[PDB]
Ligand SMILES: Nc1ncnc2c1ncn2[C@@H]1O[C@H](CSCC[C@H](N)C(=O)O)[C@@H](O)[C@H]1O
């Protein structure tokens with residue numbers, strides 16, 4: 182559940198600064214995925230579960246209009262001191278439904294990995310209501326042949342088969358425009374477009 | 378550059394879930410690693426031991442072994458999980474700093490991120506860390522041509538037997554055995570340190 186997960190990430194026994202990192206490496210393979218996507222966003226990007234803000238600051242430095250959303254108290258505060266010119270919102274995905282705010286695109290980089298079938302559905306719905314119609318979504322997650330839990334050092338994670346996740350997205354108002362996954366690893370990612 | 382090792386320490390990579398922390402008694406890799414380890418008459422060095430799953434396993438079987446891991450979070454995890462086993466926090470190249478030598482080297486998928494411009498010298502450093510006539514057991518990704526391949530941490534590489542065997546011979550290693558199923562990239566081989 183997000184409550185226990187968020188406090189696990191803000192736990193003083195977890196130094197995200199060193200583990201997650203506060204700056205992106207020039208050799209980071211995710212750059213070729215996120216950077217191109219970001220350029221395609223015509224408006225303010227919302228980095229969902231920005232954590233230490235490493236990608237938020239990186240994209241902001243490259244001229245992108247972007248803000249962050251992070252429920253982990255220690256992390257969001259940490260992100261502000263590290264990236265003083267970037268706006269970081271302290272809150273959860275569901276909190277987004279409490280405001281009329283809407284962004285042009287959504288970046289959820291491994292921020293949805295701790296949500297199972299009883300939680301992701303509602304999160305996707307809130308996300309859809311937080312992005313402009315036709316707006317984009319880039320998310321990375323863990324996939325596999327079955328929808329099942331998976332050990333993770335911070336909090337329990339979940340593997341989501343493409344069929345189940347794509348259906349959840351469609352039900353939520355998102356259409357998958359691209360996806361990628363290598364069966365030898367759970368790591369996977371996809372792009373979607375806000376629709377009906 | 379410690380970008381690779383740091384990426385391996387990241388919770389996002391989730392080393393404990395992808396590689397594991399414990400060795401299943403039914404793991405098929407056991408029949409490959411154990412027979413080899415038994416042949417090493419001395420201390421084995423687990424190069425890029427990660428979570429220390431194999432290091433603890435072989436240690437519990439009576440094998441004299443130590444681990445080498447640059448990934449901070451992983452090396453610290455290995456130490457708490459196997460308090461009886463020694464784990465050195467360093468990289469293959471750091472081996473040149475110490476005159477220490479091991480009787481055998483186990484490199485289970487710890488060299489996959491090394492392309493044609495890095496593997497050659499990494500193998501030289503390995504040769505310097507093993508006793509003459511010592512043994513080397515390594516697993517890697519193979520294929521019809523030396524090309525890069527996808528991997529969550531960083532670019533990985535497929536090494537054809539010809540190219541890899543030649544790099545090993547140049548490094549002072551002689552391939553004693555090799556295995557590979559052309560259907561899958563997974564491969565492995567044993568080698569003996571020259572005299
Ligand atoms: N509903 C939710 N909304 C936002 N963040 C959430 C969430 N549930 C879990 N998280 C979190 O998502 C993050 C996942 S780990 C870091 C992800 C970040 N995009 C990066 O690549 O560095 C953590 O900061 C954690 O607090």
Ligand SMILES: Nc1ncnc2c1ncn2[C@@H]1O[C@H](CSCC[C@H](N)C(=O)O)[C@@H](O)[C@H]1O
Nearest residue numbers: 382385396425426427448468469485486487
């Ligand atoms: N130069 C280097 N020296 C030592 N380890 C290295 C390295 N370059 C990459 N590695 C790493 O090698 C490991 C490969 S993945 C895990 C391998 C381990 N033998 C197992 O089977 O579980 C990672 O822990 C990673 O940090």
